[PDB]
Write a protein that binds this ligand. Structure first.
Ligand SMILES: CCCCCCCCCCCCCCCCCC(=O)OC[C@H](COP(=O)(O)OC[C@H](N)C(=O)O)OC(=O)CCCCCCCCCCCCCCCCC
Ligand SMILES: *[C@@H]1O[C@H](CO)[C@@H](O[C@@H]2O[C@H](CO)[C@@H](O)[C@H](O)[C@H]2NC(C)=O)[C@H](O)[C@H]1NC(C)=O
Ligand SMILES: *[C@@H]1O[C@H](CO)[C@@H](O)[C@H](O)[C@H]1NC(C)=O
Ligand SMILES: *[C@@H]1O[C@H](CO)[C@@H](O)[C@H](O)[C@H]1NC(C)=O
Ligand SMILES: [Ca+2]
Lengths: 208, 480, 494, 331
């Protein structure tokens, strides 16, 4: 693909300390709350300069689950939108961090917030960017997608969405539970054996 | 009509002009007057190229004078004679008239043989001695060629078909034939803080410009506009002279002066016709006394210059006394008469109408109102007809060749209608040029060129719109 | 007397989100008979636009080029708004016989003047509204047979469009407020719009005669994070890289308005560094607003030896003391997934505590997205809402688009949803664009309403009021008129 | 010593997307030069296939640069484009050249040259041996261009013409020319068929091609009052600064290149004549504004909706027909 093969990018990110502090503040608040700290996330998201929104969801399971220890699940998703300054709201990219109940992925949230703070000050975006944090690992993501496309595929209940950003083109999910890393691992297989385009994997390998 | 078009490529044109020569009583010898009613013929040819040929002929009839003409021609000035003798006032264009008076006449200053006037009429002095009737003929053809037709008149037209020579370039400078023309007057005010410029166009156009264009409208239709442009500047910076305390634009800088203003002149035209621009420039206070200089370096009287096929420009200096008022801006008013004098001279010179060239010992009439004589207009009409016919013939030949070469181009019914119209118009115009009817020939040639160019530039004659005939076998084989 | 006049004014307004908006406006009036052939001499009114009124019989013309989208929910209501791309609507004179031929010729003529691709206006993207887009000038009868409207949502606005626009101004970027229009600064923004309006107006107070008015407008919004990130205030030098040095000599009125009202506190105003000439208080868009006036024709303000640079302290206010959201805003989106069927949905909000008001909605859809009108639903608060008026025009393949026009009463403190189903079509291989995997665009929808006002407004005379207060005629003192545009939508086909 | 009286120029870019920044940059450089040397904006027909100055991906909006020092913006403050992204096609280019344009087309978008006009034509894009591609869908061959120029010559719509192409194997495009008074220049020969790739970091793309870069550098020193001939543009960008070899064809041209000035094709120098002649001249009901959104009138402008019912005559006809049929088979 020549749109990406014939171009070049010079990175200039530098926010490590901010990401760390965000992670430390997020972990303590979640400890106190016992669940996702929503007011802190909204306030912090507003402080970096996004449009913030929330969503509530609930469902009833066919039988109690031993593996995850859930029978009737309710939660909330928080998402923030960065609007492309020199375009209209027609296309969008998604960066998401799925949170469980196992006290993990605080550093992922810190990195997400630092990246949003860095991205907010540029002029060259041609698409909107959505920063998403979900409540339960994969139920929140399913609820958010169903509410976004206005389809009742599974039967999950939710409050109506108030903010949208156009048609989604690509998405990336991040999982990280340590300040340092020794390697990065990538996953490509999806539900019912569907696959993404090979160019995304080639890109990731080109930036490695 | 392919065969007729193949015949149009080689065309014989013969332009004939009627001249009526009148011999007053006791002008030609009495024995010479015995055979006075008879016709003489003067024909000449212009060498050309590309298989088209043209010849020009003067058709002179030597009828004797009617008596009433004597009362008029008898005595007085030439103006009174013209006034009284112009009674018929019939419709005839390309036609002349010549009168032959006695060698002792007191209406013609007694130092000159010829009197050229406006209104298609002239006066010539004969010989009482019976040397021959040849010198009369020479004098008459001399006067007729000063007016009417010359090989130089048909040089801007016929330019391609004539062998090139040194000095060919300047003979191509006049404007080309067209149906209509646009004329726009613009006032340039680069310093609105110092000068408050108001002009009176509507009265000036109505009083001076409109009669001129009414006279010139025999050739085509004319439009007139006007506007004012603020903060419009020139493309050179004037040189200062401490001794004169004035500023100069030199002859070498003139070809680069009008460059910036053309960014604001263009993109307001309302048609597809050729446009002519006349600019009046009021200099800024910083270089207020501005003068244009000639090749020698002496200031020019008109303070203006023109460019071939584009227009002209004039710089207008504000009076020093009018600067006295403390209040700035200063109200300044332009004198329209001098401005229109210069601009109308330039416009007359842009169409190619030069000052008349006189035969030795001749006298020209005083200048008329609206600045144009009739024989000059008829000369313009002759040239226009010739140019139109040449263009139409060339266009038809090119169209026939293009349709012959490529086979998958569609010929619609409108195109064929236009082609037939063009061929008929060309033939009619040639016939009427041979017969000597200039106005009908001019109209027919206009129709000919319009129809031919309407057919040639049709949007459907683009070869790219049709499926290639080479690849059709690919399509018909699979089910055949 | 010159018989024609020029006025110019710049207004600067801080926004509730921490951004700053600016609007330029130039207006000329001429007492001439432009509607009939005969005028040949022009001074302040441009010749390029002046000869179009008679050649094509025109009563009113409105043209706009825009990039971006106005965020009403976070920025507030604007003075003037336009959709993305290019729009054009024209009112013709009743003597015009064939409106379509004249409309095509006029679009082709305008494309040459403004360096835009307006030749792409054809029958597949042109509509004739039946209740919307009424005349903005003096009118006697309103027969919509003589009105045309079109939108091209993918037209680009760049410097090539601004060069002809600046060429039509009299001082022509060399004097007055025009010296502040610099392209790179003007496009380093979140919103940018250029517009031209022509209409007839009253000649004097009795208003028994006609005068012709031309108005040129430009509006931008400067974002806080990208521009002016530092604590330094919003000055003219940092927004435009230029200061004001001298007034246009041809203008009779030239001034800058700065909005200094503070909603939270009482009788407290924002700080403007240079002391202003005068203060002006009036009801604008249903609210009492205070403005500082800098008069550029005063030689106390601007002289040969000293220029003008205005400075303004503004930051995003705390969460408390922020202004309330407007009484009306809307959104639009596409529902479903796949390449066969889908739905188009619109959301309309009424945030007024106790008043209900009606709205008029206009939608246009291309022929390839075939609509099923028996699936149209309008629901408020979970109950069905029946429109008072509805007009529907079905599409014809490759001939004309869909048109839908409804009048709906919105209940107070609620949200209303409007939906309709569509099916996608398969085209011929020669009917796609050079980049066929990008998609097609549905043009933004139009919303018109009379919104209730907080304060009652007095009658106003247009010759003595600021130019931003005389854009729409006012019928009642207790409401005001608004026209909103949604965002365009991108849809894919097999 | 030229003998022309006006100048025209047609500059065309036939690329697409954002990563093809280079072709647009080349066209903008040519436009800047020709304007600086004198040709008015109404005599230039500029066709650009995509917008790079106000593309939302541009880190510097409303600018296009030629070198990474970013000291020369070639888009400029003053610019006008006649053909936008979706009106640039092979067909429209051929129509503009041949004059076979739709009747409603405005003046600014057509080439109104005559017998006394010098014309400059410049092209850039992706090409091969004997063709040049427009966007990605179509192409124009050398034969078609050679035919269009003969169409222009037969009607005498130019005096002299200069043709320049900046493409890979660009010399193939002037091989079939057969009309008088045409001079042609190219950047590469038939064998030379690769293209360079060095993207700029700050912007993110390859900025400009080499040959036009050196040609624009030699046109930045030339002024309106220059005496440079056409023999000096034949020695620009030698294979050592470029890696390909430029070519020229000047056997259809009648004048010696040592006597042809640069400004005859790149500028506008007028012929001036002092004027020394002159023509003697003798010295009660007020009007109201329309109402926005009248609700009651809108409600009453349409008749009320009643449900549709089949007409009675149709029912009578149906049942009469059916029973008339029934009375045959039964009686
Ligand atoms: C709306 C539809 C239009 C119907 C036309 C109205 C006429 C109805 C005729 C009644 C049926 C009928 O005629 O039954 C008996 C028929 C015709 O008589 P026959 O004994 O065959 O005599 C002629 C032989 N020789 O004997 C036959 O030839 C047997 C075939 C029966 C025909 C079908 C009965 C018609 C009823 C409608 C059913 C249609 C389904 C819907
Ligand atoms: C998706 O469909 C399900 C039905 O399958 C909806 O579930 C009902 O929701 C209402 C209101 O929340 C409850 O009172 C019912 O008990 C639910 N029915 C069942 C069978 O569970 C659900 O609301 C729909 N979700 C959305 C977002 O529309
Ligand atoms: C000139 O205008 C007159 C007046 O309408 C018209 O009759 C005539 O046909 C026009 N002549 C040309 C050559 O267009
Ligand atoms: C403007 O200039 C005038 C004349 O020099 C001066 O008197 C005045 O003080 C200046 N501006 C101010 C400070 O009012
Ligand atoms: Ca142009």
């Amino acid at each position: 693909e020549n749109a990406m093969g014939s171009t070049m990018v010079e990175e200039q990110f530098a926010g490590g300390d901010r990401a760390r502090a965000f992670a430390r503040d997020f972990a303590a608040h979640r400890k106190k709350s016992g669940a996702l700290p929503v007011a802190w996330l909204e306030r912090t998201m507003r402080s970096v300069g996004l449009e913030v929104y929330t969503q509530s969801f609930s469902r009833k399971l066919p039988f109690p689950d031993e593996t995850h220890e859930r029978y009737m699940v309710s939660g909330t998703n928080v998402y923030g939108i960065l609007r492309a300054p020199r375009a209209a709201s027609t296309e969008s990219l998604v960066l998401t961090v799925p949170c469980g109940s196992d006290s993990t992925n605080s550093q992922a949230v810190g990195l997400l917030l630092a990246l949003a703070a860095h991205f907010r000050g540029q002029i060259y975006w041609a698409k909107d960017i959505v920063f998403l944090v979900t409540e339960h690992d994969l139920l929140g993501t399913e609820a958010w997608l169903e509410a976004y496309h206005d389809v009742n595929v599974t039967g999950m209940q939710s409050s109506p969405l108030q903010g949208r950003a156009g048609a989604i083109q690509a998405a990336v999910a991040l999982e990280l539970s340590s300040d340092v890393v020794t390697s990065l691992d990538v996953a490509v297989e999806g539900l019912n054996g569907q696959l993404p385009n090979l160019d995304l994997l080639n890109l990731f390998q080109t930036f490695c | 009509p392919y065969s007729q078009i193949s015949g149009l490529n080689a065309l014989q044109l013969r332009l004939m002009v009627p001249v009526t020569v009148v011999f007053t009583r006791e002008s030609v010898p009495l024995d010479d007057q015995e055979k006075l009613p008879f016709t003489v013929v003067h024909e000449r040819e212009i060498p050309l190229k590309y298989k088209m040929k043209i010849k020009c002929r003067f058709q002179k009839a030597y009828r004797r004078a009617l008596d009433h003409e004597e009362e008029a021609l008898s005595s007085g000035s030439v103006q009174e004679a013209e006034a009284m003798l112009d009674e018929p006032q019939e419709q005839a264009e390309g036609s002349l008239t010549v009168y032959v008076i006695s060698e002792h006449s007191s209406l013609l200053p007694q130092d000159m043989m010829s009197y050229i006037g406006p209104k298609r009429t002239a006066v010539v002095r004969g010989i009482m001695h019976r040397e021959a009737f040849n010198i009369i003929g020479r004098r008459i053809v001399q006067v007729a060629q000063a007016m009417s037709l010359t090989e130089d008149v048909l040089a801007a037209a016929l330019a391609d078909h004539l062998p090139e020579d040194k000095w060919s370039a300047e003979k191509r400078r006049p404007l080309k034939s067209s149906l209509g023309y646009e004329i726009t007057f613009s006032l340039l005010n680069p310093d609105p803080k110092s000068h408050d410029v108001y002009w009176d166009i509507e009265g000036a156009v109505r009083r001076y410009v409109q009669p001129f264009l009414n006279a010139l409208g025999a050739a085509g239709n004319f439009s007139v506009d006007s506007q004012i442009l603020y903060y419009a500047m020139l493309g050179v910076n004037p040189r200062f002279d401490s001794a004169s305390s004035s500023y100069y634009l030199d002859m070498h800088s003139l070809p680069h002066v009008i460059n910036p203003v053309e960014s604001r002149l263009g993109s307001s035209a309302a048609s597809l016709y050729p446009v002519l621009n006349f600019l009046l420039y009021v200099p800024e206070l910083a270089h207020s006394p501005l003068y244009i200089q000639d090749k020698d370096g002496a200031p020019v009287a008109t303070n203006a210059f023109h460019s071939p096929r584009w227009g002209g420009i004039m710089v207008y200096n504000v009076d020093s006394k009018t600067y006295n008022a403390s209040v700035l801006p200063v109200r300044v008013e332009v004198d329209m008469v001098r401005v229109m004098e210069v601009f109308l001279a330039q416009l007359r010179l842009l169409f190619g109408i030069a000052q008349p060239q006189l035969p030795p010992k001749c006298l020209l009439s005083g200048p008329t109102s609206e600045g144009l004589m009739t024989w000059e207009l008829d000369r313009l009409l002759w040239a226009r007809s010739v140019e139109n016919l040449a263009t139409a013939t060339t266009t038809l030949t090119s169209l026939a060749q293009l349709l012959g070469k490529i086979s998958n181009i569609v010929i619609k019914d409108d195109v064929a209608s236009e082609v037939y119209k063009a061929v008929a118009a060309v033939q009619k115009s040639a016939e009427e040029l041979a017969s000597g009817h200039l106005a009908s020939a001019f109209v027919a040639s206009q129709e000919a060129v319009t129809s031919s160019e309407l057919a040639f530039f049709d949007p459907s004659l683009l070869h790219l719109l049709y499926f290639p005939d080479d690849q059709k076998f690919a399509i018909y084989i699979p089910l055949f | 007397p010159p018989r024609d006049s020029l006025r110019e004014e710049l207004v600067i307004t801080p926004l509730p989100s921490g951004d700053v908006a600016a609007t330029f406006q130039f207006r000329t009036r001429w007492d001439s008979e432009l509607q009939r052939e005969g005028v040949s001499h022009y001074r302040l009114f441009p010749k390029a636009l002046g000869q179009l009124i008679s050649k094509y019989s025109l009563r009113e013309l409105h043209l706009s080029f825009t990039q971006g989208f106005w965020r009403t929910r976070y920025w507030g209501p604007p003075f003037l708004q336009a959709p993305s791309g290019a729009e054009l609507w024209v009112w013709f004179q009743d003597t015009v016989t064939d409106v379509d031929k004249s409309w095509k010729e006029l679009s082709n003529v305008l494309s040459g003047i403004f360096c835009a691709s307006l030749n792409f206006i054809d029958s597949t993207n042109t509509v004739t509204p039946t209740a919307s887009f009424k005349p903005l000038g003096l009118a006697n009868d309103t027969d919509h047979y003589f009105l045309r409207y079109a939108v091209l949502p993918r037209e680009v606005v760049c410097t090539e469009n601004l060069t002809p626009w600046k060429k039509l101004l009299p001082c022509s970027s060399k004097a007055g407020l025009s010296v502040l229009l610099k392209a790179d600064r003007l496009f380093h923004t979140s919103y940018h719009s250029q517009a031209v309006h022509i209409r007839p107006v009253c000649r004097n107070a009795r208003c028994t005669s006609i005068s012709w008015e031309l108005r040129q407008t430009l509006s931008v919004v400067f974002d806080a994070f990208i521009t002016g990130q530092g604590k330094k205030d919003w000055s003219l030098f940092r927004m435009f890289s230029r200061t004001l040095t001298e007034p246009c000599p041809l203008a009779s009125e030239s001034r800058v308005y700065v909005d200094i009202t503070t909603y939270n506190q009482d009788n407290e105003t924002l700080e403007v560094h240079p002391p202003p000439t005068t203060t002006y208080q009036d009801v604008i868009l249903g609210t009492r607003k205070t403005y500082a006036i800098y008069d550029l024709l005063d030689t106390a303000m601007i002289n040969n030896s000293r220029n003008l640079n205005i400075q303004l302290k503004w930051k995003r206010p705390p969460e408390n003391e922020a202004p309330p959201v407007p009484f009306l805003h809307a959104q639009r989106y596409v529902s479903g997934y796949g390449l066969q069927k889908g739905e188009l949905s619109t959301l309309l909000y009424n945030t007024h505590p106790y008043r209900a008001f009606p709205v008029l909605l206009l939608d246009t859809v291309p022929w390839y997205l075939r609509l099923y009108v028996h699936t149209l639903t309008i629901t408020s608060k979970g109950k069905e809402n029946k429109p008072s008026y509805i007009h529907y025009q079905p599409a014809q393949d490759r001939l004309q688009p869909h048109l839908l026009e409804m009048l709906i009463q919105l209940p107070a403190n609620s949200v209303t949803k409007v939906s309709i189903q569509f099916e996608r079509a398969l085209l011929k291989w020669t009917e796609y664009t050079p980049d066929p995997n990008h998609g097609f665009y549905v043009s933004p929808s139009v919303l018109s309403a009379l919104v209730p006002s907080m304060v009652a407004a007095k009658p106003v005379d247009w010759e003595e009021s600021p130019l931003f207060n005389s854009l729409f005629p006012v019928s009642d003192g207790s409401n005001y008129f608004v026209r909103l545009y949604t965002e365009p939508l991108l849809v894919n086909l097999p | 010593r030229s003998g022309h009286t006006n100048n025209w120029a047609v500059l065309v870019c036939t690329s697409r997307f954002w990563f093809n920044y280079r072709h647009v940059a080349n066209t903008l450089s040519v436009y800047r030069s020709v304007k600086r040397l004198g040709i008015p904006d109404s005599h230039i027909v500029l066709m650009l296939a995509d917008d790079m100055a106000c593309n939302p991906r541009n880190p510097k909006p409303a600018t296009v640069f030629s070198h990474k020092n970013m000291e020369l913006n070639v888009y400029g403050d003053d610019v006008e484009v006649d053909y936008r992204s979706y009106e640039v096609t092979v067909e429209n280019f051929l129509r503009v050249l041949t004059g076979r344009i739709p009747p409603s087309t405005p003046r600014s978008k057509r080439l109104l040259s005559d017998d006394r006009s010098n014309i400059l034509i410049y092209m850039t894009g992706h090409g091969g041996n004997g063709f040049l591609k427009f966007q990605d869908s179509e192409e124009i061959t050398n034969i078609e261009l050679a035919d269009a120029f003969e169409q222009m010559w037969q009607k005498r719509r130019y005096n002299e013409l200069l043709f320049i192409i900046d493409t890979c194997q660009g010399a193939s495009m002037y091989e079939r020319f057969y009309s008088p008074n045409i001079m042609a220049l190219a950047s590469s020969q038939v064998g030379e068929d690769s293209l360079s790739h060095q993207p700029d970091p700050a912007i993110g793309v390859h900025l400009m091609d080499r040959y036009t870069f050196y040609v624009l550098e030699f046109l930045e020193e030339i002024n309106p009052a220059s005496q440079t001939n056409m023999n000096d543009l034949f020695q620009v960008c030698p294979k050592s600064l470029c890696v390909s070899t430029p070519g020229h064809r000047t056997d259809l041209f009648q004048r010696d290149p040592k006597n042809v000035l640069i400004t005859d094709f790149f500028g506008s120098v007028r012929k001036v004549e002092i004027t020394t002649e002159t023509i003697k001249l003798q010295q009660m009901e007020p009007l109201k504004y329309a109402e926005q959104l009248p609700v009651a009138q809108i409600i009453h402008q349409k008749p009320k909706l009643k449900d549709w019912h089949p007409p009675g005559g149709f029912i009578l006809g149906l049942w009469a027909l059916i029973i008339m049929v029934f009375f045959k088979t039964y009686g």
